[PDB]
Each structure stands twice: as structure tokens, then as C-alpha cells.
Design a protein around this ligand. Structure first.
Ligand SMILES: O=C(O)[C@H](c1ccccc1)n1sc2ccccc2c1=O
Length: 167
């Protein structure tokens, strides 16, 4: 039993809700919240910008120190940093950004990072301004992640489309 509430059940291990991931993280205070990161951990826009704003820029400060020490991530890769006021930990996962010309095939590798954590609150990787079809992101998710994932979908109309077309 966990403190997630109001999710539709897609599969044995994947649940989905029409919710703002920022407000959901503040309410649940999950163990792990997933960020839609880029390799530089530059959290300017999208989910990354929104999560970072909710931490009062503490996420960016921590991230810049991480990059200065370790260099960039790989597309498909991840790192675990603090969750600040939103969660215990933030798993920064780099899905491919189609709008940058990155290989959509790396989406499965990106989702594999989720399997290192028993329970996660997450957005649809590579969707939004990363340019991949959210329907495809949900499919790769369900077919890759074996741990318990709670997906927050921001847009109501997209949420409706994702559920009704899910096989
Ligand atoms: O609603 C959501 O959660 C997702 C989403 C996933 C990751 C980051 C930001 C947004 N949306 S809304 C939306 C509106 C127009 C076109 C695409 C999307 C889309 O993919």
C-alpha cells in the first residue's frame, strides 16, 4: 500500500492519472519523482523547468555542481539527485529529443532506468517539447518498466486519448 490515489490501472504495474506532476509530487511526497531531463541538466522549460521552479531553483544549483564534477549524461541515461521539497530523490532521465534529431530508439533505454526503483512518479518520457508521440511513450513505458510506475499526464485531452487507445 502507498499514498498514490485516483489512478486508472493500465497494467499490472502501470497506473495513469490526469495530474500536474509538480502538484502531485508535493501532495504524495513520493520516494522518487522522475524528471524529463536533458544531458546538461539545464532545467529551463518543460517538466524540468516546472520541477526546478517548485524547488526555488535548488534543483538547478545541485545539478550544475553535478555536471561540473561529472560531465553530461548520455541520451538514454539517468542520475539520482535530491528530490528537494518534492520527493526523497529525483531520477533525472534523458529521453531522446526528437526535435533535436535524437534517435527515438533510445526511448526504451531511457525507460530501463525506472527498473532500478521500486516505485516512481513520472511523466511520459520524450513527450511534450521532446517531440515524441505521447501514445508511443506510454507504449514503450508499459513494455519496458517492470517496477511500479505512476504516470502523471498534464493535458486532459491527451489523457483521454491515451486511455481510450491503449491496447
Ligand atoms: O500532458 C502531458 O503530461 C504531456 C507531457 C509529457 C511530458 C512533458 C510535458 C507534457 N503532454 S501535454 C501536450 C500538449 C501538446 C502536445 C504534446 C503534449 C504532451 O506530451
Amino acid at each position: 500500500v502507498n499514498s498514490f490515489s485516483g489512478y486508472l490501472k493500465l497494467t499490472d504495474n502501470v497506473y495513469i492519472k490526469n495530474a500536474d506532476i509538480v502538484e502531485e509530487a508535493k501532495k504524495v511526497k513520493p520516494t522518487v519523482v522522475v524528471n524529463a531531463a536533458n544531458v546538461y541538466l539545464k532545467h529551463g522549460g518543460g517538466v524540468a523547468g516546472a520541477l526546478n521552479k517548485a524547488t526555488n531553483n535548488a534543483m538547478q544549483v545541485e545539478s550544475d555542481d553535478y555536471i561540473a564534477t561529472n560531465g553530461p549524461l548520455k541520451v538514454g541515461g539517468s542520475c539520482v539527485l535530491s528530490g528537494h521539497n518534492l520527493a526523497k530523490h529525483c531520477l533525472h532521465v534523458v529521453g531522446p529529443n526528437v526535435n533535436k534529431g535524437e534517435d527515438i530508439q533510445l526511448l526504451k533505454s531511457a525507460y530501463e532506468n525506472f527498473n532500478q526503483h521500486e516505485v516512481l512518479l513520472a511523466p511520459l518520457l520524450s513527450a511534450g517539447i521532446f517531440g515524441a508521440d505521447p501514445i508511443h511513450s506510454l507504449r514503450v513505458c508499459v513494455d519496458t518498466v517492470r517496477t511500479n510506475v505512476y504516470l502523471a499526464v498534464f493535458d486532459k485531452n491527451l489523457y483521454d486519448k491515451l486511455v481510450s487507445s491503449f491496447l
